[PDB]
RNA sequence: AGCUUGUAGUCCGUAAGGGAGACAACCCAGCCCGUGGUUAAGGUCCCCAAGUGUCGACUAAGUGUUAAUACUAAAGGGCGUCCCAAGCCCCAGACAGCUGGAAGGUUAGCUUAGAAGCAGCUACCCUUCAAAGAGUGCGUAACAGCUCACCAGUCGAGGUU
RNA sequence: CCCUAACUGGAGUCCGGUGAAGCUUACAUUCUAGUGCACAGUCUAGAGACCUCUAGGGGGAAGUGAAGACCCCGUGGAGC
RNA sequence: GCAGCUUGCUACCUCGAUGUCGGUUCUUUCCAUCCUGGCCGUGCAGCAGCGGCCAAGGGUGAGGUUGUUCGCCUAUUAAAGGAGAUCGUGAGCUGGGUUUAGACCGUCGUGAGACAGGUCGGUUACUAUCUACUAGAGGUGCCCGAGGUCUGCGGGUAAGC
RNA sequence: GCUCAGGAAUAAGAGCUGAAUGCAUCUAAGCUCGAACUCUGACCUAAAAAGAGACCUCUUUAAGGAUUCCGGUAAAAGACC
């Protein structure tokens, strides 16, 4: 039979397609440290989109030296608190948590997520970790941070979000010293990312609920005379005669949306401090207006408004150091009508 | 350009007449299939 | 038809000319080669068979042609005396309905053999023995059975 | 020994590698590894390779010869690179 | 405990399987990553690659990658693991990569049969090499 | 070919009839195929501004009629955006009979043509009079 | 052709039980019930009862680990490896190398200028010395040397068909 | 049709009331190869499998409906 | 000699029914390689060819006639490869052809009728019991009681060509 | 709007060292390179991994969980925030 070849419908690199087990994106891989100690991640909340007019400066690009319009996503980033230090041990069966020390001072609203740890061992526990590193058992150190969404207004929740980050250094002793220095303090977004650099974004995407094969995998409808015979948006065949089973690679209906996704090489265009420079007339739709400091990201970002966005320094970047963008105009038109 | 060393180490070898594998000079047997007859790499 | 269609000996012989009909002729023209009038070759080697089978006449003709060419090219026109031995007396029939009255009709002729039975024989001098072996080895390549070469007379001379 | 027709070659020892620059109109220079302590010296159109390990020097020479082979033309008309005039 | 330092794989597995089935205390195989598998390099690699990529995703054979998992699977085949006797036997076997901390300094014994000294030639590979060729970090 | 600063949707579709706007001697043409387009299953070939495509003459002088030729699109009714942010559109599609390189057989072009074909094919730019 | 049609014996049909992975007709066995004992076919690393059994060799391919069998690949080749026999040269000295020699004449007959040992008749081109050639090849209009065949000094034990 | 998208009303999804029929030797959470009247969920050897429930389209149960309408046979019929 | 992808041969299964040809949709397997990756030879200057070896990751399209498979033709294209899955796929679709009952043309027959020749017309049934798969939940098992943050035995991928 | 490599081990193949067979030889041991293939690295999922996990905190007539109530970044019912 003279068959006409067609690429497979949809991608099997994301299966099974089920609801994310949490509302907070989790990072599986941390980059390699190539500089002084610092955190490798940050968190914020998505607001909406605008566009800016910036003098093009991408090297070797066609549109170099002339004005362009770019879509940007505005992200609110109130300062985070470093609440704990965690130590990991390496063996045959991979890393294993072996110690944690919490900060003495914490926010009273953290009681909504977990009961507040009490100030027991602080100096003795830290020196315990130091002795462990001194006897060459500890391999790496990670920091535990949370957000403080009570300062914002467009986000209804008042309970913090807890997650683990990574410190970037060239030695375990340096990581431990830096973690001791920064433990139990507030870290601003400027201390993590420099303006003009690239980042990686993770977030839970918008949920569409249960969807059929056509909208879930993008299969073809029924064409022509077949479009009015009873099956229009159903799949053609569920399999062959043999094997006598339906393969897992056949398109079917189920959950669509609310998965975890990652975007690569998004550029940071502006680190702001005052919210009046991005707020349109009438505020953003369904959000309100910006009150704290923010950040502008070139392009789009996964997830809807009022969703938590995690950021980490690039893991597969190609291009060399880019530079500070030259923003000329930031659109503050009404998003409404 | 015909030079002594280049021709010495480039086109001074025998060729199997069945699988086209190149062999040494003082040989009578393809090292990979054992065919009896070997010709010589074509000159100019 | 293919060679293996008529090569096994499973059924009785079928050779009486006066009962069957319409047997096609043969291609092999002469059964003696080279210097027939000479009788003073001290070495007499021959090609023998290792298994019972049937040889078509076309295979015998091809083997004879190739041996003739090799021997004449190397030994010389007067330096040998080749002689084929087995003549094709059998008859081959090919059905041509289905199995309804499946009895066949004559299509060719074949020569049955027996294990260790001589087929060819070449006589040469002492200086052309290797050429004789070289010639007899190609002839057995066209033949439908495994074949070995035996030096019958003058074994002490060559060996 | 070195041979070339039109494009002069810059054989330069640097670190544990031998860099071949401008080979048949080449912008990306090729790299040949040096095995062991096999000290090599470049002098005009010839290369001498010293050492105390026989397999080591042999493999170093083999790498240098194999890196500089032009693999899309005819050996009759193109004959360039480094060739061994005498084994170890 | 049994030290798998330089022992034939099938010989070791057969002895351990039989003396598990006889009924006793549990057994421990340590250093189960330099056990020997006699045979040429290419043939061993080819057979293990074909064993690895053979199943169907929902219900096909899931051949393990880790070295101690491979040794356990090899012993699992010389044993009626579907019956009650076999399941009880499988409950008393523990193969470790390297040396676990609790079995540190423990008294060892060996199977005198399965010895690489009892091999004619030098045509063999070690189990960790096949484990790393199959893509396992151990 | 050389990249364009702007982004052009592929509006016209294989089977479309365009009104050629030069003085070569043809009025209407029929897009047969598009140069440098692979495609996928069931998808008709499509062409946009600055795309060289083979056509057929449907209305014109008897000598030119029934001839397979090459031509490019100079205008299209489907909108496309400038580099600095703006959308441009026309009232009607148009095409000019040319050669493989880009020399138009006609020495006179009627009406405006998009500036992007003027940059991609300089000859069309020079032969035109008004560019928008 | 696990096709069709004969014939002798024995079977399945109508035949348990034991062994072959399962197996109508293949091997042991033709069978009333209960208990003890020894064997047949077949097996004895584990699954699985009983040998990680003994003696002498072979295979390096996971080849093989498959009585019969409707279930198991051929011609041809192998300076792969293990054996037998037959010839030939041989420590006063065989083979592979180290060496040079291959000098007398010739530049062989050759019309093209030239196929001058290597297009095309011939013959050992030396009376003579290991060698000396009508002679393969890098070279080669022709050659030419470099030198093929072919012997000679040289090592120092088996070599070769 | 390229190439599909949004929307409207009736069903469906969820809740209350009412309330049937048709396949059914038994068991049954399966998948691969072999074997077997040569097209096995049940035999042989492996591989997998914690149980219950809801929604969904129909891969398989050589799915169900039915003593084949095609071919042959019957010293069976009818019409012409 | 291999394959069983064309046509034959046989009559082992199915006549108290295993729903035919082609196309459409969707998934997968083989390599005996059309393009993409790597090599070898050439009577390979370069460009481009010719022949062979490894390699099945990705790609292999749009249209005119015809029911067609097959095949011819057109303009592109890196190329527009061939086969298997009950000649994959009718409890998914279609009904163009073949295969009922009606009628016409030609040829046979004395005639009823026939064609293995052509042409026009001609109903596509079912509420899913079991299993498989796609997603969503409730339990029980491990466990001091609860919460949080992680590791990673394993599974998937083309995520790029 | 984004959509990479780099590395390890290899196939055909190209070499080094090297004897049986004094020499020579890519192979008989041994070694070095070598593909859109394989593995690793990115990415999605994953303590119901029966070897059924690690660490920390809060508290054992409490911590904490559910139902009622006002809602939506979620939603066929459940679940989730
Ligand atoms: Mg009987
Ligand atoms: Mg029986
Ligand atoms: Mg009768
Ligand atoms: Mg069906
Ligand atoms: Zn060869």
From Swiss-Prot, chain A:
Q: Which GO terms describe its cellular component?
A: cytosolic large ribosomal subunit
Annotated region Disordered: the residues are 1-20
Q: Which GO terms describe its biological process?
A: translation
Q: What GO molecular function terms would the record report?
A: RNA binding; rRNA binding; structural constituent of ribosome
Keywords of this entry: Ribonucleoprotein, Ribosomal protein, RNA-binding, rRNA-binding
Per the record, the domain of life is Archaea
Glycosyltransferase as a keyword? Answer: no
Q: What role does this protein play?
A: One of the primary rRNA binding proteins, it binds directly near the 3'-end of the 23S rRNA, where it nucleates assembly of the 50S subunit.
| Subunit description | Part of the 50S ribosomal subunit. Forms a cluster with proteins L14 and L24e.
**Family per record:** Belongs to the universal ribosomal protein uL3 family.
**Name recorded for this polypeptide:** Large ribosomal subunit protein uL3
Species name: Methanosarcina acetivorans (strain ATCC 35395 / DSM 2834 / JCM 12185 / C2A)
Curated annotation (Swiss-Prot), chain C:
One cellular component GO annotation, for this chain's record?
cytosolic large ribosomal subunit
Which gene is transcribed and translated to give this protein? rpl10e
Please give the HAMAP family that the UniProt record associates with this protein: Ribosomal_uL16_arch (MF_00448)
Family annotation (PROSITE patterns): RIBOSOMAL_L10E
The protein's organism comes out as Methanosarcina acetivorans (strain ATCC 35395 / DSM 2834 / JCM 12185 / C2A)
Query: Keyword set for this entry?
Result: Ribonucleoprotein, Ribosomal protein
The highest taxon in the source lineage is Archaea
The similarity annotation says: Belongs to the universal ribosomal protein uL16 family.
Listed GO biological process terms: translation
Q: Which CDD domains match?
A: Ribosomal_L16_L10e
Q: Which InterPro entries match?
A: Ribosomal_uL16, Ribosomal_uL16_arc, Ribosomal_uL16_CS_euk_arc, Ribosomal_uL16_dom, Ribosomal_uL16_euk_arch, Ribosomal_uL16_sf
Q: Which Pfam families match?
A: Ribosomal_L16
What GO molecular function annotation could you give as one example from this UniProt entry? structural constituent of ribosome
What is the name of the protein in this document? Large ribosomal subunit protein uL16
UniProtKB/Swiss-Prot annotation, chain D:
Sorted alphabetically, the keyword list is: Ribonucleoprotein, Ribosomal protein, RNA-binding, rRNA-binding
> What superkingdom heads the lineage?
Archaea
What processes in GO biological process is this protein linked to?
cytoplasmic translation
Query: In this UniProt entry, which cysteines form S-S bonds?
Result: none
Q: Which GO terms describe its molecular function?
A: rRNA binding; structural constituent of ribosome
Q: Name one GO cellular component term.
A: cytosolic large ribosomal subunit
Indicate the quaternary assembly.
Part of the 50S ribosomal subunit.
Function recorded in the entry: This protein binds to the 23S rRNA, and is important in its secondary structure. It is located near the subunit interface in the base of the L7/L12 stalk, and near the tRNA binding site of the peptidyltransferase center.
Entry's family note: Belongs to the universal ribosomal protein uL6 family.
Protein name per its UniProtKB record: Large ribosomal subunit protein uL6
Shown chain mapped onto the complete sequence? 89 to 176 of 176
UniProtKB/Swiss-Prot annotation, chain F:
Which keywords are on file for this protein? Ribonucleoprotein, Ribosomal protein, RNA-binding, rRNA-binding
* Keyword GTP-binding annotated: no
What are the annotated GO cellular component locations?
cytosolic large ribosomal subunit
Kindly give the CDD domains that the UniProt entry links to this protein.
Answer: Ribosomal_uL14 (cd00337)
- Which GO biological process entries does UniProt record here? translation
**GO MF annotation, one:** structural constituent of ribosome
In terms of Gene3D superfamilies, this protein maps to: Ribosomal protein L14
Function recorded in the entry: Binds to 23S rRNA. Forms part of two intersubunit bridges in the 70S ribosome.
How is the subunit organization of this protein annotated in UniProt?
Part of the 50S ribosomal subunit. Forms a cluster with proteins L3 and L24e, part of which may contact the 16S rRNA in 2 intersubunit bridges.
**Family per UniProt?**
Belongs to the universal ribosomal protein uL14 family.
Q: What is this protein called?
A: Large ribosomal subunit protein uL14
- Gene this chain is encoded by: rpl14
């Amino acid at each position: 039979m003279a068959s006409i070849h067609r690429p497979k419908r949809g991608s099997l690199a994301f299966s099974p397609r089920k609801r994310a087990k949490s509302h907070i994106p989790r990072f599986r891989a941390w980059p390699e440290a190539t500089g002084e100690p610092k955190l490798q991640s940050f968190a914020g909340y998505k607001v909406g989109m605008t566009h800016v007019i910036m003098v093009d400066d991408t090297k070797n690009s066609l549109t170099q030296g002339m004005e362009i319009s770019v879509p940007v996503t505005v992200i609110e980033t109130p300062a985070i608190r470093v609440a704990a230090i965690r130590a990991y041990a390496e063996d045959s069966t991979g890393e294993k948590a072996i110690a944690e020390v919490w900060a003495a001072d914490l926010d009273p609203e953290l009681k909504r997520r977990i009961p507040i740890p009490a100030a027991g061992n602080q100096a003795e526990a830290l020196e315990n970790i130091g002795k462990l590193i001194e006897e060459g058992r500890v391999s790496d150190v990670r920091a535990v941070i949370y957000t403080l969404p009570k300062s914002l207004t467009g986000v209804p929740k008042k309970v913090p979000d807890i997650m683990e980050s990574g410190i970037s250094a060239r030695d375990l002793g340096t990581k431990f010293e830096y973690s001791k220095t920064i433990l139990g303090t507030l870290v601003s977004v400027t201390d993590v990312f420099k303006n003009g650099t690239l980042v990686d974004t993770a977030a839970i995407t918008i949920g569409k609920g249960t969807q059929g094969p056509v909208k879930r995998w993008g299969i073809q409808l029924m064409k022509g005379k077949h479009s009015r015979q009873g099956s229009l948006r159903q799949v053609g065949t569920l399999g062959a005669f043999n094997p006598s089973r339906v393969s897992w690679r056949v398109p079917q209906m189920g959950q669509m949306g609310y998965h975890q996704r990652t975007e690569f090489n998004k550029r940071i265009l502006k680190i702001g401090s005052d919210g009046e420079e991005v707020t349109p007339e009438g505020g953003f739709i369904n959000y309100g207006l910006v009150r704290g400091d923010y950040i502008l990201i070139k392009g789009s970002v996964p997830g809807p408004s009022k969703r938590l966005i995690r950021l980490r320094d690039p893991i597969r970047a190609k291009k060399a150091d880019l530079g500070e963008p030259n923003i000329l105009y930031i659109s503050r038109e009404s998003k409404q009508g | 350009a015909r030079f002594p060393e280049a021709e010495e180490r480039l086109l001074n070898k025998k060729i199997c007449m069945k699988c086209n594998a190149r062999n040494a000079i003082r040989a009578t047997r393809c090292r990979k299939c054992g065919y009896g007859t070997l010709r010589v790499k074509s000159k100019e | 038809k293919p060679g293996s269609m008529y090569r096994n000996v499973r059924q009785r012989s079928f050779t009486r000319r006066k009962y069957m009909g319409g047997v096609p002729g043969s291609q092999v023209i002469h059964y003696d080669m080279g210097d027939k009038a000479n009788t003073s070759f001290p070495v007499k080697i021959s090609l023998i068979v290792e298994e019972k089978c049937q040889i078509r006449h076309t295979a015998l003709e091809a083997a004879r042609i190739t041996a003739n060419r090799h021997l004449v090219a190397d030994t010389g026109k007067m330096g040998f005396y080749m002689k084929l031995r087995v003549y094709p007396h059998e008859v081959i029939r090919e059905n041509k309905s289905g199995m309804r009255r499946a009895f066949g009709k004559n299509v060719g002729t074949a020569a049955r053999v027996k294990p260790m039975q001589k087929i060819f024989t070449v006589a040469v001098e002492k200086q052309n023995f290797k050429a004789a072996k070289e010639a007899l080895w190609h002839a057995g390549q066209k033949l439908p059975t495994p074949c070995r070469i035996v030096v019958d007379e003058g074994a002490e001379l060559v060996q | 020994s070195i041979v070339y027709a039109h494009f002069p070659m810059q054989v330069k020892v640097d670190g544990k590698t031998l860099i071949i620059g401008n080979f048949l109109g080449e912008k990306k220079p090729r790299f040949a590894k040096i095995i062991g302590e096999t000290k090599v010296k470049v002098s005009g159109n010839d290369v001498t390779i010293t050492g105390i390990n026989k397999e080591d020097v042999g493999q170093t020479a083999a790498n240098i010869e194999q890196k500089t082979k032009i693999k899309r033309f005819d050996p009759r008309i193109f004959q360039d690179g480094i060739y061994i005039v005498q084994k170890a | 405990v049994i030290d798998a330092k330089g022992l034939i794989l099938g010989r070791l597995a057969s002895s351990v399987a039989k003396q598990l089935l006889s009924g006793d205390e549990k057994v421990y195989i340590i250093n189960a990553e330099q056990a020997i598998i006699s045979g040429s390099r290419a043939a061993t690699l080819r057979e293990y690659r074909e064993t690895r990529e053979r199943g169907a995703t929902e219900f096909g054979p899931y051949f393990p990658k880790r070295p101690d998992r491979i040794l356990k699977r090899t012993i699992r085949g010389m044993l009626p693991y579907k019956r009650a006797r076999g399941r009880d036997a499988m409950s008393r076997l523990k193969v470790y990569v390297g040396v676990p901390y609790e079995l540190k300094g423990a008294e060892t014994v060996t199977i005198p049969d399965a010895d690489m000294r009892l091999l004619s030639s030098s045509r063999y590979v070690e189990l960790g090499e096949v484990s790393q060729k199959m893509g396992s970090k151990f | 070919m050389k990249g364009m600063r702007s982004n052009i949707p592929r509006a016209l579709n294989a089977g479309a009839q365009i009104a050629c706007v030069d003085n070569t001697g043809a009025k209407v043409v029929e897009i047969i195929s598009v140069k440098k387009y692979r495609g996928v299953k069931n998808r008709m070939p499509c062409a946009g501004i600055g795309d060289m495509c083979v056509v057929s003459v449907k209305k014109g002088t008897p000598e030119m009629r029934k001839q397979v030729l090459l031509a490019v699109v100079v205008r299209q009714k489907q909108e496309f955006r400038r580099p600095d942010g703006l959308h441009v559109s026309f009232e009607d599609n148009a095409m000019v009979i040319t050669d493989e390189e880009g020399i138009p057989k006609g020495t006179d072009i009627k009406g405006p043509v998009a500036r992007e074909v003027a940059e991609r094919f300089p000859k069309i730019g020079t032969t035109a009079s008004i560019i928008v």
